[PDB]
Structure formats: structure tokens, C-alpha cells
Amino acid sequence: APPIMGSSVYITVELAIAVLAILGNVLVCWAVWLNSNLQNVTNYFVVSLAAADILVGVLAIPFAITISTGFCAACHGCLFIACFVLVLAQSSIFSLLAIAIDRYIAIAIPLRYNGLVTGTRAAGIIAICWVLSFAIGLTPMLGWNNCGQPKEGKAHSQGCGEGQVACLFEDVVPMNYMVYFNFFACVLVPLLLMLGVYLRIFAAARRQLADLEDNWETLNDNLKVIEKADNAAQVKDALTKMRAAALDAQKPEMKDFRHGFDILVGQIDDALKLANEGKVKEAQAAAEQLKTTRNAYIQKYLERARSTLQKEVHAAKSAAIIAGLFALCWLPLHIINCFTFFCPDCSHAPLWLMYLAIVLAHTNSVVNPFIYAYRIREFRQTFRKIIRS
């Protein structure tokens, strides 16, 4: 069958992907620019990620359409056309890893997050990562290429000029670069690092949430021991334990919460002094006042701390879905390259499967705006306003 028929389907799908990638991620950038509630360090890497996806539609997809034709070109010009998408993929990887690290810092050390993770430092990290992406992705242009050994018979059959080659990806980009350097070192290792970071984030969240519940139970259990205690020493043992737990849990709403813990510790000290004097009944009656503080203050702190953690678990899952989708989207093309490289006795993957793998990789530049709309309310609402207005 004529090559332009099969090409037409591939080309049309590529253009449709390019349009969607541009529109969706331009909307992401426009939402962050307009909504100050979306202007945080986490969303600065989201914008950098969206910028890479906009460049996929504007440049990488037209480059992929061009290189599918095998047109005659100077080999190093062809290399740029072949490698630029690797720059964008590398940048995306850096942004995805930065988002994962950012969410770990926020959940593991929230008391020092604002002082450690700032917008100015984030912009500096984004700039460095872009420079690194260019270096990694354009490494073939540094000499790790096949331009020294051009397919002369293919170039002559296509009427290429002297010094030109038929511009095809696998003719100019070495497969040992694609598999060992790009896939294994620069894609697989960072993705396994993100998985590691995500596991730590979820484990930290779970651990925190049994700590909140453990403290709620413990306060309640120690109130029961005091009620059915029969001597002053037992009341003292329970109160002593309580006081330590109250200070451990203390480490508009913040003013009433600090006042709630000032009442709690003070009421524990009142009953402790009565227990040390041997006045058991008085100590017990004083410890009963703690239930008033628990209902009006402590329980509200427990449902708000728990609520905050849930929101973090939710936000970490949304970010992990984005990283997972990147892996799902790019792995097929990388796995095919592994078969091409590691099995010279296997027939090369057919052209239609190469096209399918390539389009799948490009579809990843479309999916992120939909994940933000379906999982993050502040993005969703902002998208509605932009579209309406």
C-alpha cells in the first residue's frame, strides 16, 4: 500500500494530539497565573511540566511528523529533530521528581516547609533542571551518534545531497544511548526514585494518622483509669502520663487551640497537685473537668489535624497518578527499544506498532490537565471561570 495512506492516519492523530496538548496545558498555565490560591511551589513545577507539554505540541510533534518521512537532511540537523523530544521528556521527569520531593517535605517536616521550600529557590531549581534536560537530551549532538557511519545506500536511493542522510530516528540516534543512558539511567532510575519517595509519603501519612488516633485513645483511657482508681498514687500515675502526652501533642483557630492546650495542661496540673496531697476524691473530680476541655477543644484539634492529613494524602495520590501515567505512557516505546537493542535475532517491531508507541508517548502531554480538573477543586473551579468568561 502507498506509504502516504498509513502516514496520513499517523499524521492526523499526531496533529489531533498536538492541538489537545496545547489547549489543555495553556489552560493550566492560565489558571496558575490568574489564581493566587494556585500560586505555590508545587504548582510552579506543574507549570514547568505544562510548559514541556506545550512544547511537545508546538515542536516535538511537528518534529516527529517530519522525521517519519525520512527526508534528506544534514545528519546533525536531523539529530536535533530526533533529540528535542528527549529534552522535554527529561524536563518532565525532573518536574515529577520535584513535585514528589515537595510533597514529602510538606508531610514529613511541615513546621520547616515554608522556610525551606520557597518560590525563589523553586524557580532556580526549575532553571537548572531545564539546562540539565538540554544536556541529557541533546547528548547525541555531543558525539554519541551514528553520523560518522551514515547509511549511504539509503541516502543515495532517496537522492540526498552530499553530506546528507535520510533523516530517520533509529539511523542517527544510537540504541545503546536510548537504552542504557536515556531509559535505564535517566528515565527508569528517577521513576524508581519517585516510587520510593511516594512510598515514604504514604507511610508517613499513615503513621501520623496512627499517632493522632493513638493519642485520642490514650487520653480517653487515662481518664477511665482515673475514674476507677482507688488511691492517690494511681491517679498520679495516670495524670503523669497524661501531662507528657498533652505536651507532646502541643508540638484564629491557632489561638483557640493554644488556649485549649493551656487549659488542658493547667487542669492536669491542678489534679496532679491534689493527687500528690493524697486527696483522691478531689483529684478525680478535678480530672473530670478535663472532659469539658476535650469536647470543646481537643476533639476539634484531632478533627482538623486528621482532615489536613487526608487532604495531603489526596494531593499526594493525585501527583502520583500523574507520575504513573507518565510511566505508562512512555514505557511501551522504551520497551520496544529494548527489544530492538537486546534481541538482534528478533524481527524489528512493525511500523504500525512504532507509530502506536510514539503516539502513546505524546498522549501523556494531554492527560495532566484532565487529572487536575477531576482531582483538584481549585484547578477545576478556575478552569470553569476561564472557560465561562
Ligand X SMILES: CC(C)CCC[C@@H](C)[C@H]1CC[C@H]2[C@@H]3CC=C4C[C@@H](O)CC[C@]4(C)[C@H]3CC[C@]12C
Ligand Y SMILES: CCCCCCCC/C=C\CCCCCCCC(=O)OC[C@H](O)CO
Alpha helices (H) along the chain: 3-34, 41-55, 61-67, 75-108, 113-116, 119-137, 152-157, 169-172, 175-176, 189-208, 211-227, 232-250, 253-276, 280-288, 290-293, 299-301, 304-342, 351-375, 377-388
Is residue 94 close enough to count as binding ligand CFF by CB under 6 A?
A: no
Counting contacts by CB under 6 A, is residue 10 touching ligand Y? no
Q: Is 94 in the site for ligand OLA (CB under 6 A)?
A: no
Q: Least Å distance between CB 52 and Na ion? A: 5
Distance between CA atoms of residues 28 and 262, nearest Å:
45
Query: Which CB, 145 or 208, lies closer to ligand OLA?
Result: 145
Per CB under 6 A, 67 contacts ligand CFF: yes
Position among 59, 72, 147, 212 found at the interface with ligand OLA (CB under 6 A): 147
Q: Name which position in 101, 108, 175, 188 contacts ligand OLA (CB under 6 A).
A: 188
Q: Which residues ranging from 315 to 374 are in contact with ligand Y (CB under 6 A)?
A: 342
Helix, strand, or coil here: 64? Answer: helix
* Amino acid type, 277: E
Name the 3-class secondary structure at 74: strand
Name which of Na ion, ligand Y, ligand CFF, none residue 293 binds, using a CB cut-off of 5 to 8 Å depending on partner kind: none
The residues pairing with 165 across neighbouring beta strands, listed in sequence order, are 73
Find the residue with minimal CB distance to ligand CFF: 169
Binding mask 159-188 for ligand CFF (x = CB under 6 A): ----------xx-------x----------
Which of these segments, 27-35, 97-105, 211-219, 348-356, binds ligand Y (CB under 6 A)?
Answer: 27-35
Residues 6+ apart with CB under 8 A from 246: 261, 264, 265, 268
* Residue 276 CA to its chain's centroid (Å): 54
Q: Which does 29 bind (CB under 5 to 8 A by kind): ligand Y, ligand CFF, ligand X, none?
A: ligand Y
Buried b (16+ CB within 10 A) or exposed e, 53-70: bbbbbebbbebbeebbeb
Residues numbered 268-327 forming contacts with ligand CFF, rule: CB under 6 A: none
Give min distance, CB of 365 to Na ion, in A: 5
169 binds, among ligand CFF, ligand OLA, ligand Y, none (CB under 5 to 8 A by kind): ligand CFF
- Asked if 113 is part of the footprint of ligand Y (rule: CB under 6 A), the reply reads no
Binding positions for ligand Y, 42-61, rule CB under 6 A: 44, 47-48, 51, 54-55, 58-59
Residue in 316, 260, 296 with CA at minimum distance from that of residue 105? 316
Instruction: Determine the Cα–Cα distance for residues 176 and 145; give it in Å rounded to an integer.
Output: 10
Min CB(359)–ligand CFF separation in Å: 10
Contacts to ligand X from residues 321-360, by CB under 6 A: 328, 331-332, 335-336, 338-339, 342-343, 346-347, 349, 353
Give the nearest distance from C-beta 315 to ligand Y in angstroms.
Answer: 18
Compute the distance between CA of residue 137 and CA of residue 54 in angstroms, rounded to an integer: 17
Q: Quick check: 147 binds ligand Y (CB under 6 A)?
A: no
Contacted by 347, from ligand Y, ligand X, ligand CFF, none: CB < 5 to 8 Å by type: ligand X
Among 85, 97, 125, 229, binds ligand OLA (CB under 6 A): 125
Nearer to ligand CFF, 294 or 334 (CB): 334
With CB under 6 A, what is the number of residues at the site for ligand OLA? 75
Buried b (16+ CB within 10 A) or exposed e, 10-46: bbebbeebbebbbebbbbbbebbeebeebebbbbbbb
State the helix-helix crossing angle for 304-342 and 211-227, rounded to 10 degrees. 150
CA-based radius of gyration for the chain: 30
Please say whether the beta carbons of 75 and 155 come within 8 A: no
Q: How far apart are alpha carbons 209 and 304 in whole angstroms?
A: 11
Instruction: Tell me which DSSP letter residue 346 carries.
Output: S
In the complex, which residues of this chain contact ligand CFF (CB under 6 A)?
A: 64, 67, 85, 169-170, 178, 333, 337, 354, 358
In the complex, which residues of this chain contact ligand X (CB under 6 A)?
A: 73-74, 76-78, 80-81, 328, 331-332, 335-336, 338-339, 342-343, 346-347, 349, 353
